[PDB]
Design an enzyme around this catalytic site. Structure first.
Site, short mmCIF file in Angstrom:
data_model
loop_
_atom_site.label_atom_id
_atom_site.label_comp_id
_atom_site.label_asym_id
_atom_site.label_seq_id
_atom_site.Cartn_x
_atom_site.Cartn_y
_atom_site.Cartn_z
N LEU A 65 -11.55 34.33 -19.66
CA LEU A 65 -12.46 34.94 -20.62
C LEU A 65 -11.62 35.49 -21.76
O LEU A 65 -10.73 36.31 -21.53
CB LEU A 65 -13.29 36.05 -19.96
CG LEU A 65 -14.44 36.66 -20.77
CD1 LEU A 65 -15.44 35.59 -21.16
CD2 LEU A 65 -15.12 37.76 -19.98
N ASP A 66 -11.91 35.04 -22.99
CA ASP A 66 -10.99 35.28 -24.09
C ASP A 66 -10.96 36.76 -24.49
O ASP A 66 -11.76 37.58 -24.03
CB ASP A 66 -11.36 34.40 -25.29
CG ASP A 66 -12.85 34.38 -25.56
OD1 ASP A 66 -13.58 33.68 -24.82
OD2 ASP A 66 -13.28 35.04 -26.52
N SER A 67 -10.00 37.08 -25.36
CA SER A 67 -9.73 38.48 -25.70
C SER A 67 -10.94 39.14 -26.36
O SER A 67 -11.30 40.27 -26.02
CB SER A 67 -8.51 38.55 -26.61
OG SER A 67 -8.58 39.67 -27.48
#
Ligand SMILES: [Br-]
Ligand SMILES: [Br-]
Length: 232
Positions: A65-67
């Protein structure tokens, strides 16, 4: 400081659970913060300070899950890390906020603006209309800065428009694992003779874990709470 009974309990946990990742940290940084937190609670030394014994905590995540995104991150602990490869098959759910009129090189609000088009002609009915072109088995080109890439087949189980306050449209999307929400938002802007990028992205479900029901908040990242929520 060492609590031997809690240490035994921690190292006895095996299974999969979910936590709530806030916006900001990468998924690796959150795993590191969670690993250090549980070891400190039991009073065990850092991973750089384990004696290479069996008393080494094993942990990992099951789908990045991206930043800039928020929501469900699946975690495997103990032998439950061997289950994470199969967790990728589960469907996902997102709540995304797209912004018409502006496109970025990352397809979200963190990147640099690359294009601007008007959007005053786009009505809510116009958006609801073209959502069916993106429902079902569709072709989709992955974002450029993701790891250009060749177009890949993906599955959309449902899409619904929850809110339209020009230029912002909020979408509820149920999709397969390999679906790119940034690609969907960018293409929805294109299909409406404009452009778009993702302002906000929340993963509300991955597989059997939902944000509403299962995802552990930070104050519940404890040995006892994880034991109670574990899926062996
Ligand atoms: Br898919
Ligand atoms: Br994406």
């Amino acid at each position: 400081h060492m609590k031997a009974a809690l240490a035994t309990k921690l190292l006895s946990l095996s299974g999969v659970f979910a936590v709530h990742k806030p916006k900001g940290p990468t998924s690796a940084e959150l795993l590191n913060r969670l690993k250090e937190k549980l070891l400190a609670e039991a009073g065990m030394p850092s991973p750089e300070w384990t004696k290479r014994k069996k008393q080494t905590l094993k942990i990992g995540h099951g789908g990045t899950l991206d930043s800039a995104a928020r929501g469900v991150l699946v975690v495997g602990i103990g032998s439950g890390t061997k289950m994470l490869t199969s967790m990728l098959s589960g469907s996902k759910r997102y709540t995304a906020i797209g912004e018409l009129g502006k496109a970025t090189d990352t397809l979200d609000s963190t990147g640099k603006v690359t294009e601007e088009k008007p959007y005053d002609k786009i009505t809510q009915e116009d958006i609801e209309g073209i959502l069916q072109k993106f429902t079902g088995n569709i072709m989709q080109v992955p974002p450029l800065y993701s790891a250009a890439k060749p177009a890949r087949p993906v599955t959309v189980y449902s899409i619904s428009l929850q809110k339209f306050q020009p230029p912002f449209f909020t979408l509820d999307v149920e999709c397969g694992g390999g679906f790119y929400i940034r690609s969907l938002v960018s293409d929805i802007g294109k299909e409406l003779s404009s452009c778009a990028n993702v302002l906000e992205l929340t993963r509300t479900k991955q597989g059997p874990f939902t944000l509403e029901e299962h995802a552990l908040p930070e104050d519940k990242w404890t040995i006892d709470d994880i034991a109670q929520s574990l899926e062996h």
